[PDB]
Amino acid sequence: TDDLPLCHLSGVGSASNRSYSADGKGTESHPPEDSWLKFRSENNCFLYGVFNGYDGNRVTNFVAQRLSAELLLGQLNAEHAEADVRRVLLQAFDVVERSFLESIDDQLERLKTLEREISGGAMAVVAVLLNNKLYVANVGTNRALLCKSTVDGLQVTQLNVDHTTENEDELFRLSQLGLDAGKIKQVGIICGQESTRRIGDYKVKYGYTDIDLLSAAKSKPIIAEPEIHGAQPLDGVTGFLVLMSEGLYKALEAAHGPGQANQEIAAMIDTEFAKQTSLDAVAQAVVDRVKRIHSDTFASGGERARFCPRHEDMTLLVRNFGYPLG
């Protein structure tokens, strides 16, 4: 079923999470919960995605497929208006949600499983192409960058917004729900997660009322509705699209330092672009490079050393837009 034409102008790189051992170069690992999408509808419609899962990969491997069914099987393939394309996604992300919730409806090793699926979830970033017009749907902390080649440098602009507690808008939304800004922004974490929007997570979606921090709330504090970003004109553009998981920009940031991460990552993708035969290679190269920078930092510890005990799954997706590969 889930086997339609794959895109050929898009590469992906990935590296499972890994933990460091005091002894040094020593590393470990854990079940990897990250997935991506790089399909192409027979009607010439492009759909890319990166889903960073948490607490089980029983969700990432679902939303991935299910999202495709509600998007590449007609519903979007057509000469739709801007607001139309938005309306379809909205309806799409919803179908995945409501459906998934219905899914999770199945020794004493039972309580073991329950606490799992009831707390399983995932965040996602979806990019859609339709006539040189780009659309970005977003739920969570994954980033999406557009990189245009300037005759005065390389322009880098993030298309989405991080749904964290540091989001002036996200906070206000939770405030209008009746919660306390200061207090929520203070803890900076809500149920092990920092994201203020996510898919699945039956626990906080239906029982938020039983959590001290979310006690007072006329509606769900953690919602799954995605933030769509008005079509982007890609006619005369010449560069590339980047979809990367939290785990990636998160590591790079821990080593080098907060901010200036988007440019640096982009800067790297630039170099490796002139040093590879395939996108996948371009991609993987950067993931490796970053994976390296992390380990080295911890090993050759000093100051920033105390910020790299390990790192989560890293996923990078690159969609070339006429940029010189050779």
Partner: protein, 79 residues
């Protein structure tokens, strides 16, 4: 009428494509689309805001422009 968030959202159907800030976010912030350029106005303080740039905060820009648009200060929670 524009007190209702859903209505405010409806006024963004023809919002100029290429704009940084998300429509839905603008509405949540109490803004409504006038019709010229990327100019929006608080349904409360009737204050207008335009010239958005990437990385802008709806509520942020809003509080800066009109540091008192009640809505932004919570005097609005119909319940």
């Amino acid at each position: 009428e524009f007190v209702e968030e859903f209505n405010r959202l409806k006024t963004f159907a023809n919002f100029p494509s290429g704009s940084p800030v998300s429509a839905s976010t603008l509405a949540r912030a109490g803004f409504l689309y006038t019709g010229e350029g990327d100019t929006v106005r608080c349904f409360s303080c009737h204050a207008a805001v335009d010239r958005w740039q990437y990385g802008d905060s709806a509520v942020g820009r809003h509080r800066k422009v009109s540091p008192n648009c009640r809505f932004i200060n919570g005097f609005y929670l119909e319940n």
